[PDB]
Structure formats: C-alpha cells, structure tokens
CSV table of N, CA and C and ligand atoms in Angstrom, one decimal:
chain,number,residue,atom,x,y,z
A,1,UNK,N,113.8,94.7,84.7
A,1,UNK,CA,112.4,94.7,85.1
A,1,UNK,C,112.1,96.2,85.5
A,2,UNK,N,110.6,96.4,85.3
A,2,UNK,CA,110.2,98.1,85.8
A,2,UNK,C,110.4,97.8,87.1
A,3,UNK,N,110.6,99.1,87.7
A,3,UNK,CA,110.7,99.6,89.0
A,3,UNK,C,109.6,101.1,89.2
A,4,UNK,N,108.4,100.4,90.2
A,4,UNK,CA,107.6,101.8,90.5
A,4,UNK,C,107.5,102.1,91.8
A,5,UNK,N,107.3,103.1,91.7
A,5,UNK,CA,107.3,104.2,93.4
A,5,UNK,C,106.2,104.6,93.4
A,6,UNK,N,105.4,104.2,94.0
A,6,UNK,CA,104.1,104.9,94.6
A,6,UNK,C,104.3,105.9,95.7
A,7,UNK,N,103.8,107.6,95.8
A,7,UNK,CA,104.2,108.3,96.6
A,7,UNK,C,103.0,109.1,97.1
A,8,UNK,N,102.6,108.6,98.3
A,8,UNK,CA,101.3,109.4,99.0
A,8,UNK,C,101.9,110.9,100.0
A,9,UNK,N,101.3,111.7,99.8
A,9,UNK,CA,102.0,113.0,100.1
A,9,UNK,C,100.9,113.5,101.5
A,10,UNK,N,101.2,113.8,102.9
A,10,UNK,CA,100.7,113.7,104.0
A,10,UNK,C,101.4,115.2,104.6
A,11,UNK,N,100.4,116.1,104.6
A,11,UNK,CA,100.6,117.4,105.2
A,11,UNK,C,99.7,117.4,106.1
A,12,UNK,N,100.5,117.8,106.8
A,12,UNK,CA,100.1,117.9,108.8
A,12,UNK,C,100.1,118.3,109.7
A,13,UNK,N,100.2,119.9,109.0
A,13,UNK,CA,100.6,121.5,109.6
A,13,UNK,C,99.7,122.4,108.7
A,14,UNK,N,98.4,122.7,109.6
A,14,UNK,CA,98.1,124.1,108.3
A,14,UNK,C,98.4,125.3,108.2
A,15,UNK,N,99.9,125.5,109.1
A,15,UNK,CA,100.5,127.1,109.1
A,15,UNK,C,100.9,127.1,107.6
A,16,UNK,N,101.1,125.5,106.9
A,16,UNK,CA,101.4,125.8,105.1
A,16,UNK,C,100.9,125.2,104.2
A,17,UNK,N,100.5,125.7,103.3
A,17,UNK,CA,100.0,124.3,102.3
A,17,UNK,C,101.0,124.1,100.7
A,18,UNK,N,101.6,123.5,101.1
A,18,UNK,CA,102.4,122.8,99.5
A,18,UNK,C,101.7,122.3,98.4
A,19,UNK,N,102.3,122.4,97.1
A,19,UNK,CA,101.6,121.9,96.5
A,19,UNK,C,103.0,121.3,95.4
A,20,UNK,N,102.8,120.4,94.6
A,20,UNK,CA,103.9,120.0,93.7
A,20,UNK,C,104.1,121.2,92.5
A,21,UNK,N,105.3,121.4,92.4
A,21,UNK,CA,105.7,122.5,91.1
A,21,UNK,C,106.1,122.0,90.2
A,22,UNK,N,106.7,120.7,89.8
A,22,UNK,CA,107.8,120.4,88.9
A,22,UNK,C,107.9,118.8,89.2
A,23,UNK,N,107.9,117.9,88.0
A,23,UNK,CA,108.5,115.9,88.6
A,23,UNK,C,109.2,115.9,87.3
A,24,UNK,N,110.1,115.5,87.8
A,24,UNK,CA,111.0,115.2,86.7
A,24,UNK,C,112.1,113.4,86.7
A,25,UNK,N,112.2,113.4,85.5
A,25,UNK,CA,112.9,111.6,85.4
A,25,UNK,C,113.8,111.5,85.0
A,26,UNK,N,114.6,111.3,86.0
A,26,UNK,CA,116.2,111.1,85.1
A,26,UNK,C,116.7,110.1,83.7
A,27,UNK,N,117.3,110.7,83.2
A,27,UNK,CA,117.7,109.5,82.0
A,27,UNK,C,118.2,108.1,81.9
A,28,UNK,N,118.6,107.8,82.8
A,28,UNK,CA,119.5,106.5,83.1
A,28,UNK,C,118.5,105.8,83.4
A,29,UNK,N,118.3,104.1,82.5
A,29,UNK,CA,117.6,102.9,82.9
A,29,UNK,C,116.6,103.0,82.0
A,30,UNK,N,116.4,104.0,80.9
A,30,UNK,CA,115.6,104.0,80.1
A,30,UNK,C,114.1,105.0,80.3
A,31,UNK,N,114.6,105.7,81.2
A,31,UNK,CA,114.1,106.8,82.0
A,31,UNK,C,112.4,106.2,82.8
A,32,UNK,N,111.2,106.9,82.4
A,32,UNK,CA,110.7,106.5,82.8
A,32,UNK,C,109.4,107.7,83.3
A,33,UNK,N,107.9,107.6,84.1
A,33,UNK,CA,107.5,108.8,83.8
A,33,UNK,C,106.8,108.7,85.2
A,34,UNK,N,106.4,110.1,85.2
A,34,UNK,CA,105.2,110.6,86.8
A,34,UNK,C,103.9,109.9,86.2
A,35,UNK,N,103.1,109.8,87.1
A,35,UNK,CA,101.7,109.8,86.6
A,35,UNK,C,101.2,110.0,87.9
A,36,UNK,N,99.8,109.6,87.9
A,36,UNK,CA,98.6,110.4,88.9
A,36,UNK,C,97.9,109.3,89.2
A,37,UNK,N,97.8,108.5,89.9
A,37,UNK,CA,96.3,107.4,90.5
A,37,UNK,C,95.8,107.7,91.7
A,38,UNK,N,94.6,108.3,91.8
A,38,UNK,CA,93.8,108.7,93.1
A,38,UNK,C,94.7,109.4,94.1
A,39,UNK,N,95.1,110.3,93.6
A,39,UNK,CA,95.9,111.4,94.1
A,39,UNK,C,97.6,111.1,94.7
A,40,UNK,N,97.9,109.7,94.2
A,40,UNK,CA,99.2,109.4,94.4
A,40,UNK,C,99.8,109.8,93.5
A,41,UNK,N,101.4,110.0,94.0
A,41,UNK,CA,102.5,110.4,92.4
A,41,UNK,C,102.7,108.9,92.4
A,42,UNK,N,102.8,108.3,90.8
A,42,UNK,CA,103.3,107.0,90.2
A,42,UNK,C,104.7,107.2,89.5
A,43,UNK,N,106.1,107.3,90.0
A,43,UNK,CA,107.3,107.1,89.4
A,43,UNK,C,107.3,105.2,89.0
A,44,UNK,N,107.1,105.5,87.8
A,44,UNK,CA,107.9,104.0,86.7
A,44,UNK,C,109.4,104.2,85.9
A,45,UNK,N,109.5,103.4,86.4
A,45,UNK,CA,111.1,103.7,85.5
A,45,UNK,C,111.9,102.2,84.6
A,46,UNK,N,112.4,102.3,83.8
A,46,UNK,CA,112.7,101.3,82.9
A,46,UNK,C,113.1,99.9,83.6
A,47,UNK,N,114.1,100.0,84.6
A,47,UNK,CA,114.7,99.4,85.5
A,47,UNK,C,115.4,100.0,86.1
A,48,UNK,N,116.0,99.4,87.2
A,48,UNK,CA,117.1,99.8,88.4
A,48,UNK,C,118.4,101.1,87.6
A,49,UNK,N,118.5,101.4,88.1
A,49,UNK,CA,120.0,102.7,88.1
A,49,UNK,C,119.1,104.1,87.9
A,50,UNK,N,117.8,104.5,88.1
A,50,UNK,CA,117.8,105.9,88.1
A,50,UNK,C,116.4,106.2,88.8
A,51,UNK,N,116.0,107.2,88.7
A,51,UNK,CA,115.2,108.1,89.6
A,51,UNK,C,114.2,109.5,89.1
A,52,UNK,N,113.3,109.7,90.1
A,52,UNK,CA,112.7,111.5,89.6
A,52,UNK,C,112.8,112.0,90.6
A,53,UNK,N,112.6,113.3,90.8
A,53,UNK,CA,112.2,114.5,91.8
A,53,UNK,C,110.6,115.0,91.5
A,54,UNK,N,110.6,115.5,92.5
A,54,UNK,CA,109.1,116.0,93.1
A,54,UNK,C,109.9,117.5,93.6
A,55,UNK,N,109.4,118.5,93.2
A,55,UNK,CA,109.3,120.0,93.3
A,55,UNK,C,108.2,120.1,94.0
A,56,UNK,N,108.2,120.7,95.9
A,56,UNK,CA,106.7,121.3,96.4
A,56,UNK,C,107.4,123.1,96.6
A,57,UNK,N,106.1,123.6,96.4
A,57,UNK,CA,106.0,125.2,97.2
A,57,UNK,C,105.2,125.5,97.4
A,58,UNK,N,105.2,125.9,98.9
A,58,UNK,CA,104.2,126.8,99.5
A,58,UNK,C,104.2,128.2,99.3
A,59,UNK,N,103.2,128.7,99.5
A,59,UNK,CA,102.7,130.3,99.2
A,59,UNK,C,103.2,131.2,100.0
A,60,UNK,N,103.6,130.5,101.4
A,60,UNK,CA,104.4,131.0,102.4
A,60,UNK,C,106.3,131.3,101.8
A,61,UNK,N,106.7,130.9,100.7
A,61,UNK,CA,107.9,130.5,100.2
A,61,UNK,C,108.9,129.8,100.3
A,62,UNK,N,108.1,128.6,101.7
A,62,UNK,CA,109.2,127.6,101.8
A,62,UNK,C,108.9,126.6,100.3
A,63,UNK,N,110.0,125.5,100.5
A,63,UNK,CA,109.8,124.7,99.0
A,63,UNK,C,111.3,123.7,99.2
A,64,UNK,N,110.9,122.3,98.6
A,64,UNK,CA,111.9,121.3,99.2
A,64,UNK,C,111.6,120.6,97.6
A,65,UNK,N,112.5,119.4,97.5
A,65,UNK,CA,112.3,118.1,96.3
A,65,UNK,C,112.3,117.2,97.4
A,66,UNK,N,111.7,116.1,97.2
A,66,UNK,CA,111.8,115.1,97.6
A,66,UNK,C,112.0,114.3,95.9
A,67,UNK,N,113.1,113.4,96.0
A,67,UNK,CA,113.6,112.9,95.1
A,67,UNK,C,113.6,110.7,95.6
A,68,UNK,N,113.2,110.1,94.6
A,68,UNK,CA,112.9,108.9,94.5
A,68,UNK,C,113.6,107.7,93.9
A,69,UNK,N,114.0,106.8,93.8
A,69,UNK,CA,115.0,106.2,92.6
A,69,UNK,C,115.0,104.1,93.1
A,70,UNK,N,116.0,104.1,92.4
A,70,UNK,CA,116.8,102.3,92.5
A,70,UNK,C,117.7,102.6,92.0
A,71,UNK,N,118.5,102.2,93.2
A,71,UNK,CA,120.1,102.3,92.6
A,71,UNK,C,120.5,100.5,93.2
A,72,UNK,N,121.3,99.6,92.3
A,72,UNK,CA,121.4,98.4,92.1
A,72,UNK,C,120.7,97.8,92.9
A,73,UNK,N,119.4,98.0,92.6
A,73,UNK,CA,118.2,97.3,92.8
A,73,UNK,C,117.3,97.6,94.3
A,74,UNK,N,117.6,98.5,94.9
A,74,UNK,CA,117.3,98.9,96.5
A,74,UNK,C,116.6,100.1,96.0
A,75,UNK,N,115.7,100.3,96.9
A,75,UNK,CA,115.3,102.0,96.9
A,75,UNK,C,116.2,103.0,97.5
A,76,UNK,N,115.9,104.2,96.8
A,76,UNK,CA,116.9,105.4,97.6
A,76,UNK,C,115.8,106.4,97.4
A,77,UNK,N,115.8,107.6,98.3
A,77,UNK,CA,115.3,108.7,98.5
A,77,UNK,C,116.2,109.8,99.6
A,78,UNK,N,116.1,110.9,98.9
A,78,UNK,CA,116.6,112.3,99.5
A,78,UNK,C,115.9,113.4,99.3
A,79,UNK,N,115.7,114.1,100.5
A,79,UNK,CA,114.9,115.4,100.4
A,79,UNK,C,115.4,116.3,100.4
A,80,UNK,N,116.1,118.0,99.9
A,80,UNK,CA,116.7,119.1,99.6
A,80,UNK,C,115.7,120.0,99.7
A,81,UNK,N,116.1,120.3,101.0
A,81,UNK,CA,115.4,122.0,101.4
A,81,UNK,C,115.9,123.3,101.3
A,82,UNK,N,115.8,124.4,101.3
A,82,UNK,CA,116.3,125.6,101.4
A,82,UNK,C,116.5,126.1,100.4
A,83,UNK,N,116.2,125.6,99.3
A,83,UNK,CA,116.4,125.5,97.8
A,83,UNK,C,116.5,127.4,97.4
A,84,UNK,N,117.8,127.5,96.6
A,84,UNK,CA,117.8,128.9,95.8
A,84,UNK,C,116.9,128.8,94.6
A,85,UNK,N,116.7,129.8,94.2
A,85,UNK,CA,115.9,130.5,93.2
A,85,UNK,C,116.0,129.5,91.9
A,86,UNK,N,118.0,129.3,91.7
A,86,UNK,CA,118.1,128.5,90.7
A,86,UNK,C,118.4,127.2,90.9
A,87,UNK,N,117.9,126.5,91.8
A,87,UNK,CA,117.4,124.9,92.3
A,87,UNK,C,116.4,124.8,91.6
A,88,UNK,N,116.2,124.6,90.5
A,88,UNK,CA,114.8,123.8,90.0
A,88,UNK,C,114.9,122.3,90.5
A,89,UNK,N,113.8,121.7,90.3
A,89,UNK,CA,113.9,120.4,90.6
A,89,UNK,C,114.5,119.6,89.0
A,90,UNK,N,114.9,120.1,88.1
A,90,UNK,CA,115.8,119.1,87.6
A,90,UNK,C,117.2,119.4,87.5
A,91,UNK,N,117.5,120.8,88.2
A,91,UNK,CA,118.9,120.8,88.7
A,91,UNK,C,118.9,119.6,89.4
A,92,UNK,N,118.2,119.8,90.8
A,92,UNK,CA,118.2,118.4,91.8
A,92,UNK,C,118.7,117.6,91.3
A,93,UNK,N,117.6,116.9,90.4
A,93,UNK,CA,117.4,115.6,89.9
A,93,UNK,C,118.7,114.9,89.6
A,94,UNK,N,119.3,115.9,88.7
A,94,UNK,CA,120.8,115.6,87.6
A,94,UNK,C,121.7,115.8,89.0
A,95,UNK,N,121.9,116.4,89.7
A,95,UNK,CA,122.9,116.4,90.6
A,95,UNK,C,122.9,114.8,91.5
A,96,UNK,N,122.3,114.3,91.7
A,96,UNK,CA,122.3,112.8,92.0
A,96,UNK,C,123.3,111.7,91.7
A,97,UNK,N,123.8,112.1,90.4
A,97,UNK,CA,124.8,111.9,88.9
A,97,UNK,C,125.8,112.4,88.8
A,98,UNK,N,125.9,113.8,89.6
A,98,UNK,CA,127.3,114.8,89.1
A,98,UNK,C,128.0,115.3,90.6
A,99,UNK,N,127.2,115.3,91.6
A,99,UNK,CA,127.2,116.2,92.9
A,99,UNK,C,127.7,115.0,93.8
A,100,UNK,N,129.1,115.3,94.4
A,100,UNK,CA,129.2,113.7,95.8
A,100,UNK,C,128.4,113.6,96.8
A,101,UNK,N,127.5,114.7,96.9
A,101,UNK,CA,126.7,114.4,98.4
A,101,UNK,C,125.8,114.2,98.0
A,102,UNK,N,125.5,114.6,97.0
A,102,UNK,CA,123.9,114.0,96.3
A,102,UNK,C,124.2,112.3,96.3
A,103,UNK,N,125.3,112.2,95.3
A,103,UNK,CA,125.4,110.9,94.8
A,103,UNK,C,126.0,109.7,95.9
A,104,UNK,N,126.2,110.2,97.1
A,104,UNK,CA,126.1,109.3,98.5
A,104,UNK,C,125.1,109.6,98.9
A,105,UNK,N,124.0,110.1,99.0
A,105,UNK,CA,122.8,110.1,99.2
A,105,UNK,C,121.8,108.8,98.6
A,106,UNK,N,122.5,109.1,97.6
A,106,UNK,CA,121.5,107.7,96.4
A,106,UNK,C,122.2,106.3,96.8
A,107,UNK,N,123.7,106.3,96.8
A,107,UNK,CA,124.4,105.4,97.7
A,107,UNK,C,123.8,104.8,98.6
A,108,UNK,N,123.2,105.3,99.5
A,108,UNK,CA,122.8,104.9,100.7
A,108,UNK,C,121.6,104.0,100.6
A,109,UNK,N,120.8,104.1,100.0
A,109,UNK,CA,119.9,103.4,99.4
A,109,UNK,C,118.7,103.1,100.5
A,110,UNK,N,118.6,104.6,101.2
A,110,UNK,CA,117.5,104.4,102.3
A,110,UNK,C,116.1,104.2,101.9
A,111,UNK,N,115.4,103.7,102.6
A,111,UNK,CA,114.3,103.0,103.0
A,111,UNK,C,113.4,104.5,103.7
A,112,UNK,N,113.9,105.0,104.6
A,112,UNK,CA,113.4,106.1,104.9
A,112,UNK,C,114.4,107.3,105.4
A,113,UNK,N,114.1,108.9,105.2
A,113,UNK,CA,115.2,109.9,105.1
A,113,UNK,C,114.2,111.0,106.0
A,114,UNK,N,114.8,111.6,106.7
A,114,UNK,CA,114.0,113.2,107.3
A,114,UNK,C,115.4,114.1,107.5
A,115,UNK,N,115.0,115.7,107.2
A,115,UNK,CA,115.8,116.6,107.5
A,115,UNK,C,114.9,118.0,107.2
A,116,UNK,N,114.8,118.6,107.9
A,116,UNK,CA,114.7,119.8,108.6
A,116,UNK,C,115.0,120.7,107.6
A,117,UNK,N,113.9,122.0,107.4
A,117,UNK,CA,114.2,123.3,106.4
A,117,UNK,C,115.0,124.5,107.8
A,118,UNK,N,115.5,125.3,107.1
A,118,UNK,CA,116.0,126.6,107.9
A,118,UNK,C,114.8,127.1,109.0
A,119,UNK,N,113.3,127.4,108.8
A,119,UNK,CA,112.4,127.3,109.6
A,119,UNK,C,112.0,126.4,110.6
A,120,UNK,N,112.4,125.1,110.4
A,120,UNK,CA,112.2,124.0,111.5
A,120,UNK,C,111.3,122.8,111.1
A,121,UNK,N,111.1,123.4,109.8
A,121,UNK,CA,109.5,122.3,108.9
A,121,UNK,C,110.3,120.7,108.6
A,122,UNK,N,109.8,119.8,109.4
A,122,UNK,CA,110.1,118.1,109.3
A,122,UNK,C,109.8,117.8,107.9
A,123,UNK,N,110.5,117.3,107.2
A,123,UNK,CA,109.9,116.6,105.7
A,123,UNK,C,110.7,115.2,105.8
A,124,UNK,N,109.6,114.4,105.9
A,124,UNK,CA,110.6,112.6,105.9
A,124,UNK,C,109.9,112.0,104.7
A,125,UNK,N,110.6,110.9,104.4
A,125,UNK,CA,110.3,109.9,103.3
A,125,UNK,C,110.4,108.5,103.8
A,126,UNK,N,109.5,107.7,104.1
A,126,UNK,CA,109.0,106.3,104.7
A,126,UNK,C,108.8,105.3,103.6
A,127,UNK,N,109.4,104.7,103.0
A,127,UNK,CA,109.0,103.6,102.3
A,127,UNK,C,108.3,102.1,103.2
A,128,UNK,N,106.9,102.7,102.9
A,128,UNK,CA,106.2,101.5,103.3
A,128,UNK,C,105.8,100.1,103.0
A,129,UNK,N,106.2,99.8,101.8
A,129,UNK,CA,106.8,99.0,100.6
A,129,UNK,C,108.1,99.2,99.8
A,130,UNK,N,109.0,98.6,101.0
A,130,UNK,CA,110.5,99.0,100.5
A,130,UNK,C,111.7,97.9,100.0
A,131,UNK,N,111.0,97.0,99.5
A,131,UNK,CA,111.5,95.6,98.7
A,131,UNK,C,111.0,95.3,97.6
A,132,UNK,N,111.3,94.8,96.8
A,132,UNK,CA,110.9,94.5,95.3
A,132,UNK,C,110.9,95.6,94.3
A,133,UNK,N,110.0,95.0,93.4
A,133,UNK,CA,109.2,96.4,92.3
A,133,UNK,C,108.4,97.5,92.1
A,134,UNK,N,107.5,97.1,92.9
A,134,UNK,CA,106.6,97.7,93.6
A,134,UNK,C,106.7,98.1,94.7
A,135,UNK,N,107.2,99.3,94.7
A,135,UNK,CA,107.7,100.1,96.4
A,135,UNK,C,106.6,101.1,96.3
A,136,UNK,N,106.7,101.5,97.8
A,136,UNK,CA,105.9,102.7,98.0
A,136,UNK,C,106.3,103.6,99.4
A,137,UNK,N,106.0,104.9,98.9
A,137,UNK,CA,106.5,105.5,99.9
A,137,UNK,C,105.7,106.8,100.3
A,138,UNK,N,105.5,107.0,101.9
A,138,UNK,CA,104.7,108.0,102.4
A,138,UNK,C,105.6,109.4,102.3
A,139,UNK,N,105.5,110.6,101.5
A,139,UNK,CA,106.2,111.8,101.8
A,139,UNK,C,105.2,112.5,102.8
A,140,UNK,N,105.7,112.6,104.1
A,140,UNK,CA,105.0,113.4,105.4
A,140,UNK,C,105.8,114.8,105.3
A,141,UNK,N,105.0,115.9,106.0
A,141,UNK,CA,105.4,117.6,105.6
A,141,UNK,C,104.7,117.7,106.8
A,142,UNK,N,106.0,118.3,108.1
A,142,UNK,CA,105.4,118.5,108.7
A,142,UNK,C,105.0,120.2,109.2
B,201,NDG,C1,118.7,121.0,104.7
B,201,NDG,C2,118.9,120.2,103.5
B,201,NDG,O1,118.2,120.3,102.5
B,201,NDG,N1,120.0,119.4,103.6
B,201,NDG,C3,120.4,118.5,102.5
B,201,NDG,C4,120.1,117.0,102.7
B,201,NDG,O2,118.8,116.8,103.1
B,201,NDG,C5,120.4,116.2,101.5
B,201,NDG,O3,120.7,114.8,101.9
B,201,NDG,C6,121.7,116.7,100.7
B,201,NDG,C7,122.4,115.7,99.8
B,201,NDG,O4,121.6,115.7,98.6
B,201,NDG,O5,122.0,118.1,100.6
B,201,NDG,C8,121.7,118.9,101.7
B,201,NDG,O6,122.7,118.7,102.7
C-alpha cells in the first residue's frame, strides 16, 4: 500500500528565513515523489521500506535536511545539520542505506526527532499523524 507524508514547515525566528533547495526520493519500494498542496510538501511513496529528504538554506548560510520515510511499516525521520559544501541532500538521502548512523536513525522509527545546528538553531520533526498511511508531520525551525 502507498505510504504518504504530509509536511507543514513552521519558521519561528526571523533572525533567518529558509527556504527548500533540493527533495529528493529514494529508490527502494518503488520510489515515489514530492509534490505541493497549499504549501505543504506531499512525500508518496510506493510502499513501506524507503524515504525523501528536504534540502532548506538560509541566506544567512545555515542549511539542514530534514529527511522522511517507512521503514517496516512505522514512520522514521532525521534531521542533518552543519552540512558541508558536498552534503547535497541526495548524498543525505542515500546515506540512510549505506551510513550506520544514518541507517539507525531510520531504525528508530521516530514519531518525532530535534537536534541542534553549531549556532544553536532548534529544528524538530513532530509527526502529528503518526500511524497508518496517511502520516503527517510538522517540520518547526527554530
Ligand atoms: C548536528 C547534526 O546534524 N547531527 C546529526 C543527527 O541529527 C543525525 O541523527 C545523524 C544521523 O543521521 O547525524 C548527525 O549526528
């Protein structure tokens, strides 16, 4: 069965303003794509075992992924801050798959995740619909 992620994005500091750079969809489960409804990101994906990332950057030069998925049937999300130059978000993405801390991260199969950039900036992931097909989750920036 599809699995979709609805993702409302809530900035709530105007020392920065983010904006998305890059969404990308991993290949496993028959991949799956971004879309747009009334300013939400829509991750659909074939079925359970894979995931996308979300690329944001500010003008200021901070810039994080928050990354989305189903791994055997649970939601999972992780956010990666401090990102180098050559961190695109589909390095991210694929490291989920290849990297052990990424891929205990998806392990985990959290419901909600926060961690802290080198500057001090809060970025969490809330799944406010965190059962079934239909999940949904608030990305807050603080
Ligand atoms: C500050 C930062 O980005 N830390 C992260 C963490 O958030 C994430 O869970 C992880 C595993 O993917 O790699 C990094 O340790």
């Amino acid at each position: 069965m599809v699995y979709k992620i609805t993702v409302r994005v809530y900035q709530t500091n105007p020392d920065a303003f983010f904006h998305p750079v890059e969404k990308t969809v991993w290949k496993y489960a028959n991949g799956g794509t971004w879309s747009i409804t009334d300013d939400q990101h829509v991750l659909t994906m074939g079925g359970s075992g894979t995931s996308g990332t979300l690329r944001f950057h500010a003008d200021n030069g901070e810039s994080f992924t928050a990354t989305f998925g189903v791994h055997n049937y649970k939601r999972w999300c992780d956010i990666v801050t401090n990102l180098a130059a050559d961190e695109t978000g589909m390095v991210i993405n694929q490291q989920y798959y290849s990297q052990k801390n990424r891929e205990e991260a998806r392990e985990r199969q959290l419901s909600n995740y926060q961690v802290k950039n080198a500057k001090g900036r809060n970025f969490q992931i809330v799944y406010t619909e965190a059962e079934g097909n239909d999940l949904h989750a608030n990305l807050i920036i603080g």
